Design a protein around this ligand. Sequence first.
Ligand SMILES: [Cl-]
Ligand SMILES: [Cl-]
Ligand SMILES: [Cl-]
Ligand SMILES: [Cl-]
Ligand SMILES: [Fe+2]
Ligand SMILES: [Fe+2]
Ligand SMILES: [Fe+2]
Ligand SMILES: [Fe+2]
Ligand SMILES: [Fe+2]
Ligand SMILES: [Fe+2]
Ligand SMILES: [Fe+2]
Ligand SMILES: [Fe+2]
Ligand SMILES: [Fe+2]
Ligand SMILES: [Fe+2]
Ligand SMILES: [Fe+2]
Ligand SMILES: [Fe+2]
Ligand SMILES: [Mg+2]
Ligand SMILES: [Mg+2]
Ligand SMILES: [Mg+2]
Ligand SMILES: [Mg+2]
Ligand SMILES: [Mg+2]
Ligand SMILES: [Mg+2]
Ligand SMILES: [Mg+2]
Ligand SMILES: [Mg+2]
Ligand SMILES: [Mg+2]
Ligand SMILES: [Mg+2]
Ligand SMILES: [Mg+2]
Ligand SMILES: [Mg+2]
Lengths: 157, 160, 157, 156, 159, 156, 160, 159, 157, 159, 160, 156
Amino acid sequence: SARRTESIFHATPEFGGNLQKVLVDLIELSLQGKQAHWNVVGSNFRDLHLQLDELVDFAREGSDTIAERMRALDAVPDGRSDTVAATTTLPEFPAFERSTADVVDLITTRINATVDTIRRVHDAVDAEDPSTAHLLHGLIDGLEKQAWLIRSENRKV
Amino acid sequence: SARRTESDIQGFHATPEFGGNLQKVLVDLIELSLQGKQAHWNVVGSNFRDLHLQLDELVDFAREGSDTIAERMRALDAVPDGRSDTVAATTTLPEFPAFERSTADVVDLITTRINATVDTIRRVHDAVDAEDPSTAHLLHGLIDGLEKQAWLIRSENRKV
Amino acid sequence: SARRTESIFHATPEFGGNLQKVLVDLIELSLQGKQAHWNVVGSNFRDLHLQLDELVDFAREGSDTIAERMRALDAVPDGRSDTVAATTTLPEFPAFERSTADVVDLITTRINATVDTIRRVHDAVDAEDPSTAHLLHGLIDGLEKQAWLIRSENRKV
Amino acid sequence: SARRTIQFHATPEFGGNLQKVLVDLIELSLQGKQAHWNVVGSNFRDLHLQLDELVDFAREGSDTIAERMRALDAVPDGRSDTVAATTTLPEFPAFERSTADVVDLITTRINATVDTIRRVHDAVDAEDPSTAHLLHGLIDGLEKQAWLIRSENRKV
Amino acid sequence: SARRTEDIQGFHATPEFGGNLQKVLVDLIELSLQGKQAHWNVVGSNFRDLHLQLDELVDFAREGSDTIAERMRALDAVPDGRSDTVAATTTLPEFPAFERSTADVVDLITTRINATVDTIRRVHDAVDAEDPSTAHLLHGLIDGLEKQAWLIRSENRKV
Amino acid sequence: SARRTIQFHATPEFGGNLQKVLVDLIELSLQGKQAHWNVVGSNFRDLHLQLDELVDFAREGSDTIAERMRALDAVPDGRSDTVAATTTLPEFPAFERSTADVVDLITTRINATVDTIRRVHDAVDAEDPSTAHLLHGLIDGLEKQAWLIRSENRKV
Amino acid sequence: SARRTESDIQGFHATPEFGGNLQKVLVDLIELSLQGKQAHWNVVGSNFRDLHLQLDELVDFAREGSDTIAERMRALDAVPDGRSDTVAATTTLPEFPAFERSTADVVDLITTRINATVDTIRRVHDAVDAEDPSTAHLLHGLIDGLEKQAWLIRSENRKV
Amino acid sequence: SARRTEDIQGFHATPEFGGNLQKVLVDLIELSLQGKQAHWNVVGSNFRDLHLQLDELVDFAREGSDTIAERMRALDAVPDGRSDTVAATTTLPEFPAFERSTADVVDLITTRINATVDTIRRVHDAVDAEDPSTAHLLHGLIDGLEKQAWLIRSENRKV
Amino acid sequence: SARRTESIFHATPEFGGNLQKVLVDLIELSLQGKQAHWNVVGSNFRDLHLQLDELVDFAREGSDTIAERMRALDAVPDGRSDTVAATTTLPEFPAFERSTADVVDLITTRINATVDTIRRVHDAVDAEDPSTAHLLHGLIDGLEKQAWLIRSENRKV
Amino acid sequence: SARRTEDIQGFHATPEFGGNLQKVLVDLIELSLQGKQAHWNVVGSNFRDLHLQLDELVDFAREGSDTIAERMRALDAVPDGRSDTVAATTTLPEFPAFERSTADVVDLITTRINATVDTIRRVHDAVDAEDPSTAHLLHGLIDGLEKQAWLIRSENRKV
Amino acid sequence: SARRTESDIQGFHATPEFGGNLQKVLVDLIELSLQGKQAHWNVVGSNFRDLHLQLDELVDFAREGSDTIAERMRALDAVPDGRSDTVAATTTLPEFPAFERSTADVVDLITTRINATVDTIRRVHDAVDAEDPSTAHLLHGLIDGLEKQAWLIRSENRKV
Amino acid sequence: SARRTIQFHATPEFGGNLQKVLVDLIELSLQGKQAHWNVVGSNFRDLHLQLDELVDFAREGSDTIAERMRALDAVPDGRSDTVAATTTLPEFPAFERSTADVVDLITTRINATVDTIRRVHDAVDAEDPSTAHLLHGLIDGLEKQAWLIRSENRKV
Ligand SMILES: [Cl-]
Ligand SMILES: [Cl-]
Ligand SMILES: [Cl-]
Ligand SMILES: [Cl-]
Ligand SMILES: [Fe+2]
Ligand SMILES: [Fe+2]
Ligand SMILES: [Fe+2]
Ligand SMILES: [Fe+2]
Ligand SMILES: [Fe+2]
Ligand SMILES: [Fe+2]
Ligand SMILES: [Fe+2]
Ligand SMILES: [Fe+2]
Ligand SMILES: [Fe+2]
Ligand SMILES: [Fe+2]
Ligand SMILES: [Fe+2]
Ligand SMILES: [Fe+2]
Ligand SMILES: [Mg+2]
Ligand SMILES: [Mg+2]
Ligand SMILES: [Mg+2]
Ligand SMILES: [Mg+2]
Ligand SMILES: [Mg+2]
Ligand SMILES: [Mg+2]
Ligand SMILES: [Mg+2]
Ligand SMILES: [Mg+2]
Ligand SMILES: [Mg+2]
Ligand SMILES: [Mg+2]
Ligand SMILES: [Mg+2]
Ligand SMILES: [Mg+2]
């Protein structure tokens, strides 16, 4: 009666490209987070070691969320190492052992870079699909929380 | 002191139109749940088990969604109708066919019916968002969850 | 030695029809239970709200059990909205908000109707397949428990 | 290589708006516990239990808001004096209160809390939609609590 | 260097102490049995809350009776929780037969919880004088049961 | 539309039969705890632990039966005086009892409890097969407990 | 007082015939468990994973069932024999073939062997029910659980 | 045979007893509020450990305040945990505003925990004299809070 | 750059045969363990009953581990009743009820037989694939623990 | 209004109090070590029950030793749980070497549990006089250990 | 007394060669994890769901493995490099192709890449075992877990 | 039928080697708890918590080794006197110790414990590779603990 006949959302390829930008930075952040997690040394090692894993957990869940949102709307994600390295906007993480103080500053900057990407694409994403912007909001919130939890170590008052 | 002095402070009340838009979402979510179980029981053929299991996950989400929408209506002083006669008379989903259906047919059928459910939510979205962005927040989660289900189900039939 | 050769239970279509009768009433009960769960208001709202969800949980598990028992014996269930509405024996649940006292009486009657269907088909089911009657017994027990738990609210002694 | 060679900061007004939500969430939590302990009469147990769920949500909410402030370089103040001095919630009364009275009282004070979030919503959303996302969850959860509590007093 | 070179016997309860814990035990078991009776036979306004709270009371009283009985065993005393002994020696007013209204059950159970607590409070000082470690267990029981009493009786309180 | 425009009630005899099962289940539970506390000697711990599992099953069983009575408009009586006055179980002795004695005693009293359920089974099944379903679960569980306990005393 | 006065009250004792009927059920449940694992390891081809996983669920149920039946025998003073030689010499199930088997073949093979196991339980049912309805209660659960497994497995091969 | 034939009233707290538990309650609630303030606003060396430990302290103080308040209710006393009352009657030194260093927070919170414990220790003997079962709850609180104090203050200890 | 081209461990059939020897003895042990679990009677029945189930749990997990290791290396396990009975090295478990003392000695011997098979094939397995020997070590350790836990019942000191 | 304006110091244990808890600590640690020794080396009739019960005893004694040691820290006292100190200062009779029969182990461990409890009972009143909150923890330990003693010793009881 | 008297006792230090061998294992495990997720998102076609799910299990194991190896390096005073540029420049795995891939293609592709990862571990095994058998213990678990994944994935494509 | 018609026993040297590992594992556990209680200063909480994880691993390890000895007909001695008299670990000091000192002290004593396992490894592996399997897990876990603890004191 209100039933429709069988003959049954299309996202633009630009929209997919915007999600792809978010994806590579989330993957890069997870990879750098693990690097820091392994190679951080010095005062308050353990807290940083543990917090960095929490960050990585969130970034990995986030990248799965974004990639699978792309798939739901029939976009095609690319999370391959070469693509991530070639297209990420995050500054490269330095090699070797790094002091806890250095790691705090480095990782804060890299989180902030990842968040910036999401904030940069937000309005274009929101205009086409507010339901995707919903996921972006959760990511921004969770990442900016991680930034606060990590950077607070270096704050002098 | 910054304390308010009213003895009675009323809550947010939904307009009749708003209540109607959520009612439209509700009946389609319930219908999708009923069709989801029908497919879950009656799917046969290649890759039976995966579809059987995925369809239950879809049903779980749709049932949680219908409860969320109906209870959101109650929170905003609107009154849901999820009775079988109403669902049958007012759902926009194409009817699920009778009897056993092949895995390939079930994939196509259920994908279409999820698409129909999501379309209802997307149709009322802007009007809902305009009156109450907090309800739109719930609609966003529903759209995301359902379109995820659509991908997880439909991909069975997608070739190369 | 005691091994049989490869060349290997058939239920009647009437038996399937009997399970179908149980199925539609279980689904209808779940749908009405949710309606009541949302729309119940008044004294002792919370207990009814919560108990009605427990009833719905049991009825949903029950309808899955029956439908899948049908499938196991190669019967074909029909739990579609139109079929449920057109064939259920349960009295229609009234529209709008209902008082807790009214809901107690209404839902008790609808549980009792569902149980009656199972009791009506029991002997025919038991005669053909005692293993199915086993499931019927569990349902009757669980539903009649729910009836007691709900109706006790209105009992005056 | 697309790699860049980086400080979002809340405006004072934005921080002030979240501070307003915070004190009402904390006050609601304190009032919820007061009601939880002191409610008496017909259907005591349901109210007792539901009020604790309200408090659980409101406490999670206040932590969420305060930590969002921290994330955006704002500084929360959830101290007792500040809460008492700046909360917009009508004062919850002392002593034993009937279930009927508690239902009415708590519904009003939840509604007051939601009103604050609804008042600041548009300004918060204009500056930071990600924070408004949190406000939506709070509005939804609290208005649900209001429905679950107030339905007890509904006549027909 | 400081090692003892003794068999080292454990602390043994006096007959008075044993008797005092036996008194607590029978009232805890009686309360459990009456709690179930009420759990099953309560009817009327707010049935579900009372039905559920009565089971929590029974859970606590059963754990309590086990705790006391095993405390007796630990101190070389012998519990008797048999039906005849409980019926013959409990201080609790008899629970009435048949279906009982929620209002009636609230009043009845509150009274029986209070009777159980009274028994524990009556023996407390004598128990505490001999073995403060056992008084520790009595404190937990008094606290838990008086909590149950408040949670139940508040239903009937009219303000 | 097949929609109808509705009161199963147990006969007094049926209710009486379930009452018989109930008092024996409760008595078994009380005796099980008595044994649980007072058993001593070789293999104490196993018996101590197994007896608690017996009590757990018997308590769940008594609740199941009493609530089945309620479901069918019957009224249980599980009070101490009634249990002592109407139970068919041989009295469990007071004081410390050896593991060997406890095994024999408890097996007898489980068997007595099962015998009651087996005695009323056919009459219960004739009126309500759904209740007999519950009796079967009880018979199975209790006879399992009897086997797990009595095997301790088996000679070869 | 209504207390009985016997010092020794014996339990229910199964007849030799009853003990034999449960023994028949036992060996087929164990054989099904062994064949279930064989198929679980050696299934290859289209939809491998679903069958691999479902076969373990079947094995879990059959193992729980064999324990239930053997322990029911013990409860009724009967003595089970679940040794490999006895199972091999007295099972009624057709032999599972050797080596790797295709998903389609495994579906057909295992369905047949579940059907065989259920047939044994249905064959002894009435004789078991006549002596002890409480044991028949267990048989009912076994039949229901196993026929559910049969449906969940066989549906892979059912076309349209 | 031994069954009582009375309504049997429960144990009722004296006004002094009620007042004493109210004193404990407001300090527990104040400590909770200050604990969250510190949880949010702590910055500097070893932030995370302090952030996390402060939440554990708050968890314990919240459970504690609920326990005390419900103990009051069980004994027919009436708690007041409202913001105005807590602010007006707490004995805790005010927590300062704004971001505070980890070193500062350690010292500040240790002092406020100690103040809370002091209140409990001050009322203890009077509570114990009337109701040892309540003193039982006070012992758990003193133990838990003094543990929290050790776990926090050890950060600033220089050996 | 270090990437290999697409055109990509092969175990000998003798290696597979060695794992097969372990498999049949693990399955036989599980079957005998259940037999003992059901039919053990007498002093300390309960401990033996419970410990025998723990043994069976370990042996069942072990046989799955070995069979699936065979599959991973493209060997083909045979755990069928006839094959197990015809090829197991374990002494037959006796029929009927057995005393706890007898069961202790019997099961200890059968565990020791199963362990002996693993120890006999160890060096040949280790030489070809140390990663498989890794699994053998876990099994030997777990089984010899079970042997100690069971046999200690009969130890007189 | 009622806020204090002080640094507020915590409760500090006297040297006698510290010494008394140290005595409890070494006996709890010794009991744990002997419990494991027995856990590993027990053989004979009813091995499994004893093997398993001995681990439960060790679990309780380890939690107990941690509780006491951290209670010392909370009150500004310093524990010493090192091997040499425990060996040199424990009051427990030495556990014998090699495999021991279940009957022997029951008697041996019962004696060593009783020795541990005796230490706690000996210091109790002095601890209770200074700090009833610590006596609260001692009551839990006495209760738990005497329960373990009953559960173990009952194996050897012949009636 | 048998107590040692040194104030400082150093831990086991890995040779540069040993550190390099574990680094080789690390980059291939990370690369496998990245490719595993790519396949997990982009697989389409017959039996989509099973592969989708199994690929996540593979990713979970590989991620746990990379962490284990990197942390083992840290324990032995070696310094891991799991950065994207390094992984891309030094992994031995063939590149995963772009875009959506069929279930059959993904099975073949991923099996090959697991085989490649395992080959790296087997190549460095003997040199690792020679210096530190405790690290070889970890390599054994990795090889076993990964070859299990290979079987569970590849069996989809194996015919009769 | 391939059915056989059966006593692995450790040599005294093998048993002695496992005894050496056992006493160092127990001593490490006791020292870990001492450090857990008495550590003070900057980053107290992390050290406090990490030391308990070390103790957890070392206790599981000592039980594993002692029970492996039992499995192979050897007899462990984990008594206090024996541990104090035969452990190779440098004595842990009494009294409060700074986090920096505890890091250095505990790292040394973990390294001492690992050294013992590494010293006996080859002899153990030659006789019983299945026991060496357990030693590998212990070496891996303890050296991980050493890294997690010592990293606190690392300069750059
Ligand atoms: Cl509730
Ligand atoms: Cl699956
Ligand atoms: Cl932490
Ligand atoms: Cl046990
Ligand atoms: Fe995913
Ligand atoms: Fe709901
Ligand atoms: Fe289902
Ligand atoms: Fe927080
Ligand atoms: Fe007990
Ligand atoms: Fe119940
Ligand atoms: Fe079993
Ligand atoms: Fe509470
Ligand atoms: Fe498997
Ligand atoms: Fe600790
Ligand atoms: Fe890690
Ligand atoms: Fe152990
Ligand atoms: Mg939004
Ligand atoms: Mg928006
Ligand atoms: Mg039946
Ligand atoms: Mg209620
Ligand atoms: Mg005292
Ligand atoms: Mg035993
Ligand atoms: Mg029948
Ligand atoms: Mg190895
Ligand atoms: Mg006390
Ligand atoms: Mg599949
Ligand atoms: Mg080797
Ligand atoms: Mg830290």
